[PDB]
Structure 1
Amino acid sequence: MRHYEIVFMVHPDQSEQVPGMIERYTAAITGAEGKIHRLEDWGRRQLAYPINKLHKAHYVLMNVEAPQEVIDELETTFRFNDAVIRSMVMRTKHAVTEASPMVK
């Protein structure tokens, strides 16, 4: 459908709940008949600059071929969740599958 690239930045104290978030988001997509191409936890990572008075964050990359309705629901989930700090969804021309240059 519409290939999206989703990266979100989690509060590092909520690092244990990350696979629970990933499994809910994946069940949202596949429940909406969407594909998941790559799914790359980047772990805790030192920020370039302190957002929200803190210096590290837990990063998650996810490439998705879903309809836009569940993506707007996912954006609202990121909006109202206080565990997630930043969320970025970027529309992509195609489905990407190769690992990230920082997953290496």
Structure 2
Amino acid sequence: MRPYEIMVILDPTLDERTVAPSLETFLNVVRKDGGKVEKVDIWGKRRLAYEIAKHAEGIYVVIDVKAAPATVSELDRQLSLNESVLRTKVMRTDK
């Protein structure tokens, strides 16, 4: 039960409407074990500063969970192993 800020860089090939349920199907496993989500903000398409995974564009997502370390590690696992993500960056907002 600790704060976590997660930025995820998704492929620009998928659309702006199907991004939210595609992330709900990941965050529900975070929800099943007591962890909750505060803000699932989506910055959308954005040009990224150096070529990443054969894409020069990327969808920015900020996840902002409050969850156990095991659950956040599992979430990072799952969304890093999916084919719809180019980057993941997990941090803690708390001290």
TM-score normalised per structure 2: 0.86
1:24 paired with 2:22, answer no
Identity rate, percent: 33
SS in 2 for 1:71: helix
SS in 1 for 2:94: coil
Residue 80 of structure 1 aligns with which residue?
81
Q: 1:38 offset after TM fit, Å? A: 1.5
Q: 1:81 offset after TM fit, Å? A: 1.2
1:68 paired with 2:69, answer yes
Residue 102 of structure 1 aligns with which residue?
none
CA distance in 2, matches of 1:80, 1:25: 12
* Structure 1 ranges of 4+ moved more than 4 A: none
CA distance in 1, matches of 2:30, 2:81: 19
Q: 1:17 offset after TM fit, Å? A: 4.0
Cα RMSD after superposing both structures: 1.6
SS in 2 for 1:25: helix
Q: 1:79 offset after TM fit, Å? A: 2.5
CA distance in 2, matches of 1:72, 1:79: 10
Structure 1 residues not aligned, in runs of 5+: 95-104
Structure 2 residues not aligned, in runs of 5+: none
How many equivalent residue pairs? Answer: 94
Residue 59 of structure 2 aligns with which residue?
58
Q: 1:25 offset after TM fit, Å? A: 2.5
TM-score normalised per structure 1: 0.80
The answer to which of 14-23 and 82-91 deviates more is: 14-23
Q: 1:56 offset after TM fit, Å? A: 0.5
